[PDB]
């Protein structure tokens, strides 16, 4: 991949792998989310962020701050097949004191058609206490020079009430689910949300839209319950909570289209 | 990737991704095993096997036969870092009536040095009954023309006895663990074997050698126990068994080197 001529966005092509596809031999949404993360990381490196950790500015490092995902919204029009080339363009924009947005557009590299879109809200937090911080002028000024400054857009979740229609309990991360800092990878939470979708829905529908809020992390030694209720196309409300009716981890919604 | 000039092996380069690395920012062994699978699948397509299923010959399809892994042996000298290019060369050889071998050699694409080696024994089995079959002349003759015929080599596991020194119980696959035919991906079994290795070993050692036998599949709805005992460098004996002291799934051994 590479920066675009103006230096304010990044493009990368990916060839969909054998193990990245599901039963229709198209990329899973977890594969798409992994590719979104990878092109974001390669963008960060291309504009001078670290080649051996996740992106931080100089002032973030001084203050022990990291970027963490607060919300992810993905819409897929067509999932790419095994062996297809998908090209993803990504960019960031300042969200003032709130945080930082990363947007993505997915294209079929052969047709040039848009096959999906995504946006994410990232917030600052202290890596040790996990307490949120507003973006200071020093941190914003460090990264603003890598962002378009005029708007460039790729485009409330309620709490599931007991009893859940569907559940998958006792979900636990294995080492493959952990990132280079031994934190649960953000894509693992997408997989866990979808685990409580009945298999018959997955067999007969394609996921068109997912919206996920990220409230708290699952630690390596935590156990998660995935809860789903039908709200309808098929639409669902989702809640991930720590085992034992503990803290909410994630809430979300999905929209599914019947297979052709 | 592409076939080599003589058409009898296949090479592919991979750039190690952000989510493919562990805490030392080098590829996990599960990442390496996924890359071995992907280059094998791309080799199969390059010599005229299907672009929308795992490799079968014409006679295999007529008889409802598939290739399944019986044994995997991987040795890694150096795990590639995040953003490094690893080049993998792969080839197959007939094993007479027993099955078919796939071998791999991993190289650091910048230095050209060998960083790892792998070999696998694949057997025929009926996809419906899971009963093994010897390779018939018709099937061997269909694939022999894609193999070196003179030897080209990249280079008994006992049953763990109760009580196991270490365990991880209740492991269950999620949809990301399933392949395009809704079978548990072979790399998932490597992850499950390693889950019962204590975290302190993983934190202080690198895996140098893994040998894994594959006896039976975990179904989507099965639950697996991972059992490990120290036999020693650190060496371990491994057993994966279905929950409830059910059927053995896998047995294996690993050898670990202290981190520099
Ligand atoms: C918010 C975040 C910022 O990344 C650094 C960065 C800029 F700040 C401005 C322009 C380009 C750029 F790269 C963090 C982030 C991220 C973090 C970890 C993993 C994956 C990611 F995409 N992706 O976007
Ligand atoms: C045994 C197996 C054979 O693949 C077909 C094939 C030949 F038979 C001969 C030369 C090249 C070639 F490709 C099956 C296999 C495999 C199967 C599923 C997934 C991944 C794999 F590597 N990899 O190797």
Domains, chain B, with CATH or none: 2-144 (3.10.129.10), 166-258 (3.10.129.10)
Phi, psi of B4 (to 5 degrees): -75, 165
Q: What three-state secondary structure class fits B150? A: coil
What are residue B123's DSSP bridge partners? B68
Experimental method: X-ray
Is residue A153 a contact partner of residue A103, using CB atoms and an 8 Å limit? yes
Partners of B202 on chain A (C-beta within 8 Å) are 175
Distances (CA, A) of A14 to A10, A87, A108, A148, B82: 13, 6, 10, 24, 16
Which residues are within 8 A (CB) of B19 and not within 5 positions of it... i.e. 6 or more apart? A34, A37, A38, A179, A185, A187
Q: Which member of A28, A30, A170 has the closest CB to residue B170?
A: A170
Distance between B202 CA and the closest CA of chain A, angstroms: 10
Q: Which residue has the tokens 């795992």?
A: B54
Strands (E) located in chain B: 2-3, 10-15, 65-76, 85-95, 99-108, 114-126, 132-133, 166-171, 205-214, 224-230, 234-242, 248-258
- A40 CA distance to ligand 1 middle (Å): 6
Q: Phi/psi zone of residue B145: left (φ > 0), alpha (ψ -120 to 50 degrees), beta? A: alpha
Mark whether B181 is an active-site residue: yes
Please state whether beta strands A234-242 and A248-258 pair in parallel, antiparallel, or not at all (unpaired). Answer: antiparallel
Mark whether B126 is an active-site residue: no
Q: What share of chain B is helix, strand, coil (3-state, %, to 5)?
A: 20, 40, 40
The CA distance from A193 to A72, in Å, is: 13
The CA distance from A192 to A161, in Å, is: 18
Q: What three-state secondary structure class fits A236? A: strand
Q: What is the DSSP letter of B160?
A: P
The CA distance from B184 to B219, in Å, is: 7
Phi, psi of B76 (to 5 degrees): -115, 125
Distance between B120 CA and the closest CA of chain A, angstroms: 18
Distances (CA, A) of A116 to A17, A119, A202, A207, A223: 18, 11, 19, 12, 32
**What value, to the nearest 5°, has the Cα angle with vertex A163 and ends A162 and A167?**
110
Closest CA to A219 of A148, A130, A147, A142: A130
Mark whether B186 is an active-site residue: no
The CA distance from B93 to A246, in Å, is: 54
Mutating to test ligand 1, I would choose from A1, A12, A54, A55 the residue with most ligand atoms within 8 A of its C-beta, which is A55
Burial-class residue B63 by CB neighbours within 10 Å (0-12, 13-18, 19+). middle
- The H or E element spanning position B217 is none
B181–A23 CB contact, under 8 Å: yes
Mutating to test ligand 2, I would choose from B6, B35, B43, B55 the residue with most ligand atoms within 8 A of its C-beta, which is B55
Is residue B214 a contact partner of residue B70, using CB atoms and an 8 Å limit? yes
The CA distance from B79 to B84, in Å, is: 10
The CA distance from B57 to B2, in Å, is: 21
Which residues are within 8 A (CB) of A35 and not within 5 positions of it... i.e. 6 or more apart? A14, A27, A86, A88
B143 Cα nearest atom in ligand 2: 8
Sign of CA dihedral A143, A145, A151, A155: negative
Which residues are within 8 A (CB) of B5 and not within 5 positions of it... i.e. 6 or more apart? none
Question: Does ligand 1 come within 6 angstroms of the Cβ of A41?
Answer: yes
Closest CA to A86 of A103, A104, A108, A113: A108
Q: Which of A183, A185, A186, A238 is catalytic?
A: A183
The CA distance from A95 to A79, in Å, is: 30
Phi, psi of A259 (to 5 degrees): -65, 145
- Return the number of other C-beta atoms located less than 10 Å from residue B197's C-beta: 22
Which residues are within 8 A (CB) of A231 and not within 5 positions of it... i.e. 6 or more apart? A237, A253
Written as six digits, the tokens of B120 are 């696998």
Written as six digits, the tokens of B223 are 């639950």
If you take atom 5 of ligand 2, which residue's CA is the nearest one?
B44
A99 Cα nearest atom in ligand 1: 1
User: Which parts of chain A fold into alpha helices (H)?
Assistant: 29-46, 58-62, 137-144, 186-195, 199-204
Is residue B167 a contact partner of residue B174, using CB atoms and an 8 Å limit? no
Question: Does ligand 2 come within 6 angstroms of the Cβ of B40?
Answer: yes
Q: What is the DSSP letter of B240?
A: E
Q: Which member of A38, A174, A176 has the closest CB to residue B18?
A: A38
Resolution in A: 1.4
């Amino acid at each position: 991949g590479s920066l675009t001529e103006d230096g304010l966005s990044y493009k990368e092509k990916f060839v969909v792998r054998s193990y990245e596809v599901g039963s229709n031999k198209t990329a899973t949404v977890e594969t798409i989310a992994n590719l979104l993360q990878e092109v974001g990381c390669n963008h960060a490196q291309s504009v001078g962020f670290s080649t051996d950790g996740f992106a931080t500015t100089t002032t973030m490092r001084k203050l022990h701050l990291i970027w963490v995902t607060a919300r992810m919204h993905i819409e897929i029009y067509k999932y790419p097949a095994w062996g297809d080339v998908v090209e993803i363009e990504t960019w960031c924009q300042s969200e003032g004191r709130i945080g930082t947005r990363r947007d993505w557009i997915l294209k079929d590299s052969v047709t040039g058609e848009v096959t999906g879109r995504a946006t994410s809200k990232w917030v600052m937090m202290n890596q040790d206490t996990r307490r949120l911080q507003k973006v200071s002028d020093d941190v914003r000024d460090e990264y603003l020079v890598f962002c378009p400054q005029e708007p460039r857009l790729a485009f409330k979740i309620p709490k599931l009430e007991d009893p859940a229609q569907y559940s998958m309990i006792g979900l636990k991360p294995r080492r493959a689910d952990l990132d280079m800092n031994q934190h649960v990878n953000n894509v693992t939470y997408i997989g866990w949300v979808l685990e409580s979708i009945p298999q018959e829905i997955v067999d007969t529908h394609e996921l068109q839209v997912i919206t996920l809020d990220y409230r708290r992390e699952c630690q390596q030694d935590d156990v998660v319950d995935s809860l789903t209720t039908t709200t309808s196309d098929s639409q669902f409300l989702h809640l991930l909570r720590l085992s034992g009716d503990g803290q909410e981890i994630n809430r979300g919604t999905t929209l599914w289209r019947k297979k052709p």
